[PDB]
């Protein structure tokens, strides 16, 4: 219902969206464009990394999980710098920067 109506943005529907990708997909189907019970890409993209930074998404020591969160929200610079710090994934982060360049 609230995937069709883009409502109840605060309720993460955790009963059915238990994975991270299920959350991203749940919200990107809820973002809106031009006051209550409404979320926009700017709020969502900022809300995610500002409040729930790397710390929240890298506790499982899985780096790509956070990268996908930033890249699939149009925050390409964040995801590039972030992934560029993983000494094992420097190569990959430089190139995804070149492509964007």
């Amino acid at each position: 219902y609230c995937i069709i109506g883009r409502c109840d943005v605060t309720d993460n529907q955790s009963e059915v969206a238990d994975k991270t990708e299920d959350y991203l997909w749940l919200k990107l189907n809820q973002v809106c464009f031009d006051p209550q019970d409404r979320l926009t890409l700017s709020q969502f993209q900022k809300q995610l990394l500002e409040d729930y930074g790397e710390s929240h998404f890298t506790v499982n020591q899985q780096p790509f999980l956070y990268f996908q969160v930033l890249f699939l929200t149009a925050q390409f610079e964040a995801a590039v710098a972030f992934l560029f710090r993983m000494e094992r994934l420097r190569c990959h982060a430089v190139h995804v920067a070149l492509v964007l360049f």
């Binding site: 955790s14 994975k19 991270t20 990708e21």
Partner: peptide
């Protein structure tokens, strides 16, 4: 309260 469990 988003989960941190990656789709595996």
């Amino acid at each position: 309260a988003p989960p941190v469990r990656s789709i595996y």
